[PDB]
RNA sequence: AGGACCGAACCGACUAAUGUUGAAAAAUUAGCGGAUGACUUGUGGCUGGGGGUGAAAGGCCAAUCAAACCGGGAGAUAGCU
RNA sequence: ACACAGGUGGUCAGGUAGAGAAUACCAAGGCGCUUGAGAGAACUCGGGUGAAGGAACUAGGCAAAAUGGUGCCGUAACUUC
RNA sequence: AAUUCCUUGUCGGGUAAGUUCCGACCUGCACGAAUGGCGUAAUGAUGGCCAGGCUGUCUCCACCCGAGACUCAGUGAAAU
RNA sequence: CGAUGUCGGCUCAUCACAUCCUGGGGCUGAAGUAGGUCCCAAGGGUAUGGCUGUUCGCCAUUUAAAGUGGUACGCGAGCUGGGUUUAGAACGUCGUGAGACAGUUCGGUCCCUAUCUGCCGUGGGCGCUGGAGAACUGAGGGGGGCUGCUCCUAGUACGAGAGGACCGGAGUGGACGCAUCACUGGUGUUCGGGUUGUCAUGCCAAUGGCACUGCCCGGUAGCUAAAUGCGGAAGAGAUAAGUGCUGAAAGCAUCUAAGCACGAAACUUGCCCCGAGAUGAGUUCUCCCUGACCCUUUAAGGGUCCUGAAGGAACGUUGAAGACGACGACGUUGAUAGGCCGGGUGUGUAAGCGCAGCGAUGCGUUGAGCUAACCGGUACUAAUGAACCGUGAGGCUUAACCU
């Protein structure tokens, strides 16, 4: 239930070798507004696939 | 002999004339068509590689399409391979139908079983549950002990513990073939075969006597 | 499942009479005793009907010279030779399992007559 | 599906009225008796001047069960109450002369032929 | 192990889900576009769209049948008076989900679910 | 009438499960006993350390009790670690 | 020690059903318990249901299940009546 | 026997089978008369045994509903 | 002794063989059946209950059999806590007494979120020498091996009779394991209905909330077992004990020294599964990439421009796949999910209206209405054009061909 020798910083980084974040990896450009957004999501201005939606 | 690749259509029953229901599994066996023949002089073993069904044109890749194009055959949904039995002979592009089982009397059906996910040892290994009362403290379905003491001080290999049950190749042997229907491309075997409905099966003749 | 639907309806018998639970039914059944093939009769109240096409069953409950018997029958079996409805019966449920607890005057089903 | 500790009714007129199963014979770790299976019973109740008295230990064959029997077409036959006929302990063929209630076509064998010579139905 | 079961549980019991979809269906009928989580949108389709198809056939039994579900009388006025004759030829597909990012409070994948006309 | 009966508040604490680096340095949940009495409770007062108090358990006396706590003798003494 | 599932005396006490200050649902009034979103594995906790059997479990019917109200009929041994 | 070592004494009852239980015997290792003897109606969150009912206790587990467990975002310990 | 928890029960094993069963065999005071005894054999199998805290034991009833041991008298960071052995109390006895007795009796807190090894599962990286998509051979590893009874052979062989076979074959069980959901069922708080109390929707009617899903009655799909299918084998090889054949040393005899044949559930295969990290990194098929130009401490060296393939990954709709990754399907030239349409299934004849009745209610329209995960269809909604990763012919030596 508890460790018996203090683990090293080696073993610590080895465990964290997988904790890395993946980048976005490329975010797509709107058809009409020409601005960037996550794919399959609406843009910050509220367009999606070149048509105007929300408009708040 | 060789086998054929089917597809588990589901289960029904077949009332006999003297009133005995037979639980059958319906296996649609379309035209398995040979895409490659393998000889000792090139591969070290005699075996045929068949395909079956049909695949979309845009979903088959260029390696795969070049393989089926060499064979002179329509792309199917997969490639399988059957070892040949020393006096058998097939050609590439030859179609094989359920008619092959018109004599066989008893088959072996190989599929992937239904995946039950991470299963505990009561489901998985039929361990027996400890007391459900009489004092028992948080250990009802747990595996108990897992080994001995200082001697060995290790858990032995292949100790039955919990983990992924299901979703693996299983072969059911010696199933009685009830009907061969060359018209509808069907094979009715007596019993349950592995897999959910629509799963790919592999039906060979029975190797047991 | 057009394969299975096509394949089962090749076996379904055509002249199964319309009955509903509550009905007193005589069912004639092929009973084989060595070489002779007899046909015996089992009359009782339908207490349950499962409709699944070929896999359609129905449970008939008799009180046979003593204690009570429930035969579940496969409707489309070749064993089940005849079904005839003796007394049409008026109940409100669909599965009459409460009658397992009642005998005699309590287990008494009104007649339907419409 | 009769196991140890199960109180069965008695179908013949041997004198017993209510028996208890104490073993299911016929194999090692065998759990259940059933359609026409032999058990060993003890007699928990008797009528006052029957052939078998209370606390005797003898054999019986199960003739009806609440669980029921399955026919080869898929049809089941459940009764309402488990019942046995008390066979003789050493050389079988049972004690009683009448048999009450129905029995099933799965005592159609050599020995129990006697039991289905009696037994007003099936 | 779940095989072929349908219906999200949504970390609620059955009565809180039922109540929650009753409110949220009421809000989508009322405002015609609401922002919710992406799973709650995807379940809201299977609650909301049957009310529209019930509304496509106006009768006293369907008004009462859509007032047992939904439990609000303004809502069963807009269904049967506005939305039912609005769709009226549209066979399913009364509502679209538009994914719209993540919350700030708990990083949940939001989505705007809206009715499929909103031509106003 | 009743150290009467059933049963809430109220007082308690018989069983089980949880909890056991707790939500809690003794509880929670489900049942449980008493419930007009030798009851229970508020506010104040009195009894003090070989002393109190005790329907008695070596119990209780500020989460401490086969002799409280604080300060001092005091850096007790320790053929032991 | 905590913005702690504990402890803390008195006073007011609506509706319907109910014997009732129990209990259920409500009014006045006050709250949603200061981490959320998913998924729907084992296992743990709190629960629901269960074929046939029905204490075979076990140290032991522990736990669970069962019983459960009002009126009337009826009610044994033994007894300090 | 809350007392008995030998001892699971012996006989009887209950049980298919009873080191426990009830009745009896008496060879009381090592009861016994206010450190009370023997009875004793009622009472007991008292000890032991039996039976009816009842049941997932169990045969032998199965499924379901919820809270964690698992993944994501925020905060962020501990024994060792 | 700056703590190595000690009986018994449960769960879970694992090895030994001095073998309980099954298998082979020699001797028998072995007629047969059943035995006794000894050799070989560890594949698999190897009870449920009463009593007791008990291991043990006795008893009851099974069974082919209910093996004997080791594993901290296996197993308390897996469970229990009945016994022993804390603190309370009492009996018998000992002591004047405090107390004491492995004498008895009643009551009596069992913590731990796993770092490392191990183990069960499941992925990421890199390697395998151009990249990629598939199919494979198979080194090696694991699973599985139990067995009763009935019938025939044959009431033959044997025996005076009673009784009663070897060898061989057919059937059908028990226990165990794998799969599955067609059947029989369980569940089915997501479907339908009945019903009690109360609250609300103005009210009647109808509904909804809350009361364990309020209590119930049924029930789809899925999951499931008590359900239903299948399995353990035949055969081959090398043998153990054992039995021999020919045959000397030893002109006989002799199974062994040369040579040869049998011989068992053990051994190697046969059957099922994993499996190229098998660094010894294998094979086969297919697909893709056929540009220029500088610099130097001229190397399988570095850089710039142009190109970006096969394919993968991401994203989305998701799945009888799933803890998460992973795996599978589909992304508009599209049935991947939702909705919709038709069907099925389940419940059981809705609401409104009409009629009968004083009324509760009943009847007609009406097997009505509503129907979850099911089945068959349907682009209505959502699966976006793209971007991202991956390159540009793949080293050296030697050999055989360049027909």
Swiss-Prot record, chain A:
The keyword Ribonucleoprotein applies. Coiled coil: none annotated. It holds the Pfam family Ribosomal_L32p. Keywords: Ribonucleoprotein, Ribosomal protein. Residues 1-37 are annotated as: Disordered. InterPro entries: Ribosomal_bL32, Ribosomal_bL32_bact, Ribosomal_zn-bd. GO terms for biological process: cytoplasmic translation; response to radiation; response to reactive oxygen species; ribosomal large subunit assembly. One of its GO terms (cellular component) is cytosol. GO terms for molecular function: structural constituent of ribosome. The keyword Aminoacyl-tRNA synthetase does not apply. Part of the 50S ribosomal subunit. Contacts L17. Belongs to the bacterial ribosomal protein bL32 family. This is Large ribosomal subunit protein bL32.
From Swiss-Prot, chain B:
The modification N6-succinyllysine is found at residue 38. It holds the Pfam family Ribosomal_L3. Gene3D superfamilies: 3.30.160.810, Translation factors (2.40.30.10). It comes from the Bacteria. GO terms for molecular function: rRNA binding; structural constituent of ribosome. Methylated by PrmB. The modification N5-methylglutamine is found at residue 150. The keyword Glycoprotein does not apply. One of its GO terms (cellular component) is cytosolic large ribosomal subunit. One of its GO terms (biological process) is cytoplasmic translation. Keywords: Methylation, Ribonucleoprotein, Ribosomal protein, RNA-binding, rRNA-binding. InterPro entries: Ribosomal_uL3, Ribosomal_uL3_bac/org-type, Ribosomal_uL3_CS, Transl_B-barrel_sf. PROSITE patterns: RIBOSOMAL_L3 (PS00474). NCBIfam families: L3_bact. Part of the 50S ribosomal subunit. Forms a cluster with proteins L14 and L19. In pull-down experiments interacts with CedA. Belongs to the universal ribosomal protein uL3 family. PANTHER family: 50S RIBOSOMAL PROTEIN L3, LARGE RIBOSOMAL SUBUNIT PROTEIN UL3C. One of two assembly initiator proteins, it binds directly near the 3'-end of the 23S rRNA, where it nucleates assembly of the 50S subunit. This is Large ribosomal subunit protein uL3. It comes from Escherichia coli (strain K12). The lineage of its organism: Bacteria, Pseudomonadati, Pseudomonadota, Gammaproteobacteria, Enterobacterales.
Curated annotation (Swiss-Prot), chain D:
One of its GO terms (molecular function) is structural constituent of ribosome. Pfam families: Ribosomal_L14. Gene3D superfamilies: Ribosomal protein L14. Disulfide bonds: none annotated. Changing residue 117 to A: No change in RsfS binding. Coiled coil: none annotated. Part of the 50S ribosomal subunit. Forms a cluster with proteins L3 and L19. Forms two bridges to the 30S subunit in the 70S ribosome, contacting the 16S rRNA. In pre-50S ribosomal subunits interacts with RsfS, which may inhibit association with the 30S subunit. Belongs to the universal ribosomal protein uL14 family. This is Large ribosomal subunit protein uL14. It comes from Escherichia coli (strain K12).
Curated annotation (Swiss-Prot), chain E:
Keywords: Ribonucleoprotein, Ribosomal protein. InterPro entries: Ribosomal_bL17, Ribosomal_bL17_CS, Ribosomal_bL17_sf. Belongs to the bacterial ribosomal protein bL17 family. NCBIfam families: L17 (TIGR00059). The keyword Cell inner membrane does not apply. It comes from the Bacteria. GO terms for biological process: cytoplasmic translation; ribosomal large subunit assembly. GO terms for molecular function: structural constituent of ribosome. SUPFAM superfamilies: Prokaryotic ribosomal protein L17. It holds the Pfam family Ribosomal_L17. The keyword Repressor does not apply. It comes from Escherichia coli (strain K12). One of its GO terms (cellular component) is cytosolic large ribosomal subunit. Part of the 50S ribosomal subunit. Contacts protein L32. This is Large ribosomal subunit protein bL17. Requires L15 for assembly into the 50S subunit. PROSITE patterns: RIBOSOMAL_L17.
